Structures are given as C-alpha cells and as structure tokens.
C-alpha cells in the first residue's frame, strides 16, 4: 500500500515548497528589469495561464490518477517508459549542484553570528590591498565581492576548470551537515518529510512580510519600487522578452523534473486536484512578484545611498554579494542577517527535499527490493550524491557548478517534458485523460483545458526547445573563457539524458514479441489492456483518435 498523506495542507505545503526555491527570489526579481520594465509582467502571465497551469494540472491529475511514480506512471504506454529514466537522471544531475548552493547558504549563516561581520570593510586575510570601501574610500574589488570569491570559495587560487584544486575543509563540513540533514529528513517517507515541510514552506513568507515592512520604510526604496513596476510597452515587441518569459515560467512552475507526479502519487481519489493546481501556481506568481517586490525595494536603497542611477547597482552570487553590503548599513546587522540567510536554507533545503523524493519514489516503484529497503537505498542515493557533489565545492567550484547549471536543467529536461506531453496528449489521448479525470471527480475538464495540453502546450514547449538549443550561447564565468573539452563535457552530460529516451524506444521493440504491428500495438496499449491486442482493437491506428480533441 501507498504511505499516503496526512494531510491536504501536508501535500499542499509540499507541492508549494517545491514550486517556490531560490530561482523564485533570484531570478524573476531582475529578469523583470533586465527587459523594459512591466512588457514582462504581461508574458510572464499569459504564459502561466496558457501552458504553466495546464502542464501543471495534467502532470498533478496523472500521479492522483495512476498511483505511480516518475517512471512506473508510463505503464499507459511504454514506449516512453525512458521519458522516466531521463527525469529521474536529470533530478540526479541537479541535486549535485543545488546541495552545493545550498551549503554556501549555510556557510554564510554560520558567518553572519558575530557583532562585526566579516563582510563589512577589508583588513582580514582574504582581502587584497586592491580593495576598495565605498565609505573608508571616495567590479569585483569591493569587500562583499572579496569575501565571496576568496573566503567562501577561494577562486584566487584556481585557474580554470582544468585546475579545480582540492576540496576546501569548510565546504565539505557544511556539505556533510546539509545532505545528513536531508537523509534524515526522508529515511522514513512522506510521514516524515511532510512535518518538516510545515516550517521549511512556511518561513520564507514570515521572514518576506518582514524584509517588506522594514524596505517599504527605507530612505531610498522608492525609487527601486517605481524602477521595478516601471510601465513600458517598448519592449513588448520583442522576442527576448516573450523567450525569457517562456523559460521562466516552465523553470519555476516545476513541471516536469518528476516531483509533481511522485507527490500527487500519494494523494487519494477524491482529492480537487483541479483546485490543487490552481492554488499552488497562484501562490507561485504571487509569491515571484511580491518577491520582486522585495528585492528591487533594498537595490533602490543601495542606489540612493551610493549616489549612483540603478543600472549600475543592477544585477547565482547576486544574493551572496549585494545584500551582504547592504544590510551592514542597516540597524539590527546581527538581526538581519541570520534571518536572510535561514530563509535561503529554508528555500534551498524545501528544494531539494522535493527533488530527493521524486528520484527515490521513481526508482523504488520500479524496484521492489529498494522499496523495501527504502532506509538503506536512502543512504546510497545521497552518498552518491554526496560523493558526485564533492567536485562542486573545490576551489574551482564555481566553474563546474556554472557547467553543471547550464548543461544538464536546459535542453535535456525541455525535450523530456516535450516527450511526456506529447505521450499524454496524443498517443494516450486527451479523450481518454479527460475521462481519468471524470472518473477522479466527477466533472471532465474544461474545454480550454482540453485544447490547451492537446495544442498549445507541446506548441509553446517545442518552441522553448528549439528556441534554448540555437541560441546556445559559448560557457563563460564573467571573463574566462572555457576550453574546448569543457564544452564537450558539457554536452555530453546533456545528451546523456537526451539519449535515454530512443535508447528504451529500441529496446522495448527488440524485447516485444511478434510481427511489427503487434510490437507497436503492444508498445503503446496498457498492460492491463494489453488482451485487446489479440483482438485488434487498438484505438491508435483509427483516425477518429487522432482527429479527436
Ligand atoms: C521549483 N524550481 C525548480 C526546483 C529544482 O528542482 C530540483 C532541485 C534539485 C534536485 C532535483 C530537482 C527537480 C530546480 C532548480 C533549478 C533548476 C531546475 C530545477
Ligand atoms: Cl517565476
């Protein structure tokens, strides 16, 4: 039997926690200025009602509906049954790198508990003469900058990414400390890690509300508001902005990775899934321009206290270099900062916890023998993440976090959630997932939801695909240039994602018995409709299908 939730606020509070994390506090905020100003609000929420909340629905109404997890739900048709293996591995991928920026996260708090911080002024070791201190004195000389990338992780001593170094004895501590954390809080299941998630989705909001009272009352954070909701519709004729929205929203809605269907896999049948899903992104488009809100109130402030327009001051280590100078001007350094720092813990830890549970669900459905010994498969999945982990927090880190970030949550997993949309929408038939989800409630979906996933989500997602593969720009830190084979690295880990898909394709046709027409029609029908093979009645090979929305 399922372990099933406690709760719907469990499940909703898990859902929620995974869809808002540090992308939703560090990108959205300065991609709402990187364009004109305003031009993306209108994208960003047209996007989200015509292919975010779609996607996401279809993918809460699968795991409800078929009890299964990332993998094991393609028993509809195996043919994509890779589709699964793919999102399980890119979650992999992912999770090294996202413990490393979470432990940064935690560094950073366990500096911030002393009266004078030590990114207030130079005079520490990690800080060369060339420092320079906007108040001792009349861009990466000023201390914040100093201290994030010679004390936190020490790039002065690495060249390249072919130089990494060692790993640094500080890093790894609090890389151990975070992933036990994270082990400890899934070893037993969703029992366990639904209490957890109770705080972990739950600060981020007390400490926003009071980062908001304090930057509402600063005395320059108008100028940064008026600057963040400045309206343009300029730049609404482009294509960059309409790109940039596209990707924004398919990358924090959290579509797809495979922790959405392994959490509604654990909800009953007469769950509202279709009010599930419209509660979780309204919280999540909420929550992204009330952050914005927020982040752009303190970069006003830093704007008018230097004296200096807000292009300049505008802007991964966003957060780990801006704030930390700004909040040692303010009254209350000491309170402010821990309370920063453990709301990105909390987003970070809330994160990756999710993504944790969407792997370690989708293997054990697959096997029973791990899903027996859960405890133990538990500690082999993050040891080996810990171990895989271990080459981001080298004195090169830095760069290989950059590769890892670029390379595998990119084309890899846009071309997956492409696979699973069009596996749902016309080789299972949006027909027959609207009776699934008839048969969940009671109401079929909506018209505008029908011709959403059939039309205008595999369109909007092939669009996204094609539009992130020839626009690949050249890796790149800042100034240094990468060599050739890191690129090539850099494509084979994302191709090795990619490659799992036609590579199960062959095998389930070699495997299946029969004549070619058998093959496919056994490919594609579900196992428990598999006897309807015999008597030739697969619905695939009739236009009325097909032609059927
Ligand atoms: C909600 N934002 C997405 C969350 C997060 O999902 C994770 C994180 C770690 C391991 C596994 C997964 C699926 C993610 C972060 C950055 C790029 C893509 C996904
Ligand atoms: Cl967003």
């Not at 990690?126 to 900058?145: H, I």
């Amino acid at each position: 039997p399922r372990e099933t939730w406690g709760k719907k606020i469990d499940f909703l509070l898990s859902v929620v926690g995974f869809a808002v994390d540090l992308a939703n506090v560090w990108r959205f905020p300065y991609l709402c200025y990187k364009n004109g100003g305003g031009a993306f609000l209108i994208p960003y929420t047209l996007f989200l009602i015509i292919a975010g909340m779609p996607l996401f629905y279809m993918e809460l109404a699968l795991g409800q509906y078929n009890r299964e997890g990332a993998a094991t739900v393609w028993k509809i048709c195996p043919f994509f049954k890779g589709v699964g293996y793919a999102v399980i591995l890119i979650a992999l991928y992912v999770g090294f790198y996202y413990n490393v920026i979470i432990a940064w996260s935690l560094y950073y708090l366990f500096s911030s508990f002393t009266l004078n911080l030590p990114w207030t002024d130079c005079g520490h070791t990690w800080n060369s003469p060339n420092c320079t201190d906007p108040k001792l004195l009349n861009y990466k000389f000023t201390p914040a900058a100093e201290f994030y990338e010679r004390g936190v992780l020490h790039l002065h001593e690495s060249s390249g990414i072919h130089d990494i170094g060692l790993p640094q004895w500080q890093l790894l501590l609090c890389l151990m400390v975070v992933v036990i954390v994270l082990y400890f809080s899934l070893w037993k299941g969703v029992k366990t890690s639904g209490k957890v998630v109770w705080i972990t989705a739950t600060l981020p909001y007390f400490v926003l509300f009071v980062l908001l009272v304090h930057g509402v009352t600063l005395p320059g954070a108008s100028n940064g508001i008026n600057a963040y909701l400045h309206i343009d519709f300029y730049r609404l004729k482009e294509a960059t902005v309409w790109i940039d929205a596209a990707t924004q929203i398919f990358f924090s809605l959290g579509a797809g990775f495979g922790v959405l269907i392994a959490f509604a896999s654990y909800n009953k049948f007469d769950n509202n899934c279709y009010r599930d899903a419209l509660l979780t992104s309204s919280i999540n488009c909420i929550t992204s321009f009330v952050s914005g809100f927020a982040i752009f109130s303190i970069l006003g402030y830093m704007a008018h206290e230097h004296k200096v327009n807000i292009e300049d001051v505008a802007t991964a280590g966003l957060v780990f270099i801006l704030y930390p100078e700004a909040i040692s001007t303010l009254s209350g350094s000491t309170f402010w900062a821990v309370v920063f720092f453990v709301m990105l813990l909390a987003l970070g830890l809330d994160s990756s916890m999710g993504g944790m549970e969407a792997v370690i669900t989708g293997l054990a459905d697959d096997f029973q023998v791990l899903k027996r010994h859960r405890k133990l498969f538990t500690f082999g999945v993050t040891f080996s993440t810990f171990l895989l982990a271990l080459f981001c927090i080298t004195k090169g880190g830095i760069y290989v976090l950059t590769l890892l970030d670029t390379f595998a949550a990119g084309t890899s997993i846009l071309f997956a959630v492409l696979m699973e949309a069009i596996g749902v929408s016309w080789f299972y038939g949006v027909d027959r997932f609207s009776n699934d989800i008839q048969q969940m409630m009671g109401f079929r979906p909506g018209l505008y939801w029908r011709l959403c996933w059939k039309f205008v989500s595999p369109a909007f997602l092939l669009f996204v695909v094609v539009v992130s593969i020839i626009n690949f720009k050249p890796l790149t830190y800042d100034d240094y240039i990468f060599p050739p084979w890191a690129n090539w690295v850099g494509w084979g880990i994302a191709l090795s994602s990619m490659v799992l898909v036609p590579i199960y394709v062959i095998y389930k046709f070699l495997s299946t018995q029969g004549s070619l027409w058998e093959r496919l029609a056994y490919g594609i029908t579900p196992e428990n409709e598999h006897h309807l093979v015999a008597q030739r009645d697969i619905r695939q090979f009739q236009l009325q299908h097909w032609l059927a929305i």
